Amino acid sequence: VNSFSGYLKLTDNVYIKNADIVEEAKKVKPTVVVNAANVYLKHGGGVAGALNKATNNAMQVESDDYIATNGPLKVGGSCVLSGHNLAKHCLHVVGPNVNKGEDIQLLKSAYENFNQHEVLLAPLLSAGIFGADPIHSLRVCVDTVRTNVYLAVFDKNLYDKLVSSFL
Ligand SMILES: OC[C@@H](CC1CCCCC1)Nc1ncnc2[nH]ccc12
């Protein structure tokens, strides 16, 4: 039993809700919140910009030190950093950005990072400003993640389409 509330159950391990991931994280304080990161951990907009803003830019400060030490992530890769005031940990995961021409096949590799964590709060990878089809992202999530994932979908209209079209 966990403290996630109001989710629709899609499969044995995947749950979905119309919610602002920032407000969800602040309420639940999960062990792991997933950020929709880029390889430079430049948290300018989308989920990343919103999460970073909620940390008063502490996420960005920590991320800049991470990059200065380690260099950029790989598309499809991840790193674990602090969750600041939002969660114990933040798993920064880089899904392919279609608006940069990146290979959508890397979306499965991106979701594989979730399997290293027993429970996660997460957005749909490569959705939103990353340009991928969210219905496809949900399908890859369900077919790749085996651990317990609670998906927050900001847009109510998109949430209803994801549920109604789910196979
Ligand atoms: O998938 C990443 C983005 C994409 C959006 C595209 C337009 C329709 C709504 C989704 N989703 C989010 N999901 C949960 N919380 C969020 N906070 C800020 C952004 C955000």
Curated annotation (Swiss-Prot):
Q: How is this protein's activity kept under control? A: Inhibited in vitro by GRL-0617.
Q: Which gene encodes it?
A: rep
* Catalytically driven reaction(s): Thiol-dependent hydrolysis of ester, thioester, amide, peptide and isopeptide bonds formed by the C-terminal Gly of ubiquitin (a 76-residue protein attached to proteins as an intracellular targeting signal)
Please describe the quaternary structure of this protein: May form homohexamers. Interacts with N protein.
**Record's bilayer topology term:** Multi-pass membrane protein
**Name of this protein:** Papain-like protease nsp3
Where, subcellularly, is it found?
Answer: Host endoplasmic reticulum membrane
Q: What's the stated role of this polypeptide?
A: Responsible for the cleavages located at the N-terminus of the replicase polyprotein. Participates together with nsp4 in the assembly of virally-induced cytoplasmic double-membrane vesicles necessary for viral replication. Antagonizes innate immune induction of type I interferon by blocking the phosphorylation, dimerization and subsequent nuclear translocation of host IRF3. Also prevents host NF-kappa-B signaling. In addition, PL-PRO possesses a deubiquitinating/deISGylating activity and processes both 'Lys-48'- and 'Lys-63'-linked polyubiquitin chains from cellular substrates.
- Residue ranges that the Swiss-Prot or TrEMBL entry lists as coiled coil: none
Its lineage reads: Viruses, Riboviria, Orthornavirae, Pisuviricota, Pisoniviricetes
Query: Covered residues of the complete protein?
Result: 1025 to 1191 of 7096
Q: Which residues form the Macro domain?
A: 1-167
